[PDB]
Design a protein around this ligand. Sequence first.
Ligand SMILES: CC(C)(COP(=O)(O)OP(=O)(O)OC[C@H]1O[C@@H](n2cnc3c(N)ncnc32)[C@H](O)[C@@H]1OP(=O)(O)O)[C@@H](O)C(=O)NCCC(=O)NCCS
Length: 184
Amino acid sequence: AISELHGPRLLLRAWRDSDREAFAEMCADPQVMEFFPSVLDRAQSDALVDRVQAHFAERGYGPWALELPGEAAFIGFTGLFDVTMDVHFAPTVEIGWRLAPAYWGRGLAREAAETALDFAFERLRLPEVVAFTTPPNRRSWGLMERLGMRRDPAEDFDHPLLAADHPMRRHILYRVDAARWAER
Ligand SMILES: CC(C)(COP(=O)(O)OP(=O)(O)OC[C@H]1O[C@@H](n2cnc3c(N)ncnc32)[C@H](O)[C@@H]1OP(=O)(O)O)[C@@H](O)C(=O)NCCC(=O)NCCS
């Protein structure tokens, strides 16, 4: 009973068993995982999918699996996750994305994000959605600003689920509220 969402090219859907092999491939790809602490093995990949499925069961939304009808069953994920950790901007909802590298440079993460944010603001009627990443991950924060999200550098933060001296602790914060989304 999870609502599927449609874009011109994409289907945002609940995950299925068959997705885990392809997602595991992505999670083991160093180019996909470049700006994370490490690649994931199959157990870790599967544990992430378990958390995704749990979020969908609890909330009715989550990071949707991305299908490309006419092309491919699974190309990654894009969608919403509730922010509950001890950060200055909690509680809120974040958007995130991960695409297999063959699908980069096609506006597919852009389209998936637009579709997820339309859900956020039209259906859920959320006040705001945030996103966060590390400064080196230009492809990621680039997409955040192209969507119309905006960053205040004064809101940079250390990730509370990483060590206080973790090399990748420092994150940047983008925000988009309902009014700004509507004004695009
Ligand atoms: C972050 C990520 C999803 C971005 O994907 P992406 O394909 O670069 O993003 P978009 O969908 O916005 O596509 C943008 C590119 O497509 C091009 N483009 C082509 N057709 C397009 C269209 N119809 N609409 C928009 N852009 C289009 C743009 O010119 C741009 O190219 P460029 O990177 O050479 O400047 C992807 O790089 C990824 O999965 N990275 C690894 C995982 C990760 O780090 N996630 C973030 C953790 S915070």
